[PDB]
């Protein structure tokens, strides 16, 4: 279990980084070792673990 502020920040930053990852995916410019696909994957996985571990604490 983690904090809801960390949850919201991670979900937002993950959404931002997956959308800019798809941006590098459809345009092929990468700065350094990012290369889009790595950034896309770490974005999707970071907001995957958010949706995963939030689905245990039932609080409402």
């Amino acid at each position: 279990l983690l904090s809801k502020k960390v949850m919201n920040f991670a979900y937002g930053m993950g959404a931002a980084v997956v959308i800019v990852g798809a941006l590098f995916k459809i345009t092929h410019f990468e700065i350094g070792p990012l290369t889009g696909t790595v950034m896309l994957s770490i974005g999707l996985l970071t907001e995957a673990l958010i949706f995963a571990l939030s689905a245990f604490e039932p609080v409402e």
């Binding site: 959404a15 997956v18 959308i19 990852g21 798809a22 995916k25 459809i26 896309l40 999707l44 949706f51």
Partner: protein, 218 residues
């Protein structure tokens, strides 16, 4: 936001899935058979020159049916060369923008995965005044072959295969609903795939020229 979270998640998923969807493979195969198609049509035009050379040589030796075959051969030669260099113009417009890599000689096939160079070909539902003349060129090609190469049973198979390769009429997809010809074949393909299919059209044009030359002598 009870089920609202899912929605925003669907927005995120499908804004991610409007990225690249053809893989680090298949466009690799598109590039390979593009190289194969281009080497093949280069070989075909270099032997087609010798075919028409022997054809008009035999026509100049003896006229008649040989001469009439030479006339319809030169007419389909001019029409097919017009269509051939026009498809070459479309292919250079299709791969315009991506630099051909030096030393090796192959374009970056991992890079050409968006069909943005042919986005000016049509306005969505229909063609525009760049693609309507492509349709007009295809129909002009069909009609000039059918008008020059006409009223003959030995070329009926040839003109039926030409109209079988170039059905400008709408086609049904996997569901069965119809869609315009240059929208089914070119809207949103890889740019290497569009160049591959255009070079395939060049291969069918040179194949048409080849068997109308063979039927002219056969």
């Amino acid at each position: 936001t009870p089920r609202q979270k899912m929605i925003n998640l669907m927005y995120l998923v499908f804004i991610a899935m409007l990225a690249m969807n053809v893989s680090k493979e298949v466009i690799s195969a598109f590039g390979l058979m593009n190289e194969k198609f281009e080497a093949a049509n280069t070989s075909s035009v270099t032997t087609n020159e010798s075919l028409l050379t022997s054809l008009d040589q035999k026509a100049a030796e003896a006229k008649g049916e040989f001469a009439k075959a030479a006339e319809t051969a030169h007419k389909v030669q001019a029409a097919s060369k017009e269509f051939y260099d026009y498809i070459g113009t479309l292919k250079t417009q299709a791969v315009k923008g991506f630099e051909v890599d030096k030393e090796t000689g192959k374009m970056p096939y991992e890079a050409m995965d968006r069909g943005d160079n042919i986005d000016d070909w049509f306005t969505g539902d229909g063609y525009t005044k760049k693609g309507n003349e492509i349709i007009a060129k295809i129909e002009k090609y069909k009609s000039d072959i059918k008008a020059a190469l006409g009223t003959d049973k030995k070329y009926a198979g040839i003109i039926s295969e030409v109209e079988k390769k170039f059905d400008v009429s709408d086609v049904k997809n996997k569901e069965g609903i119809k869609e315009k010809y240059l929208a089914y074949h070119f809207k949103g393909f890889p740019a290497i795939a569009s160049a591959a299919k255009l070079s395939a059209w060049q291969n069918d044009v040179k194949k048409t020229e080849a068997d109308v030359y063979n039927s002219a002598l056969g």
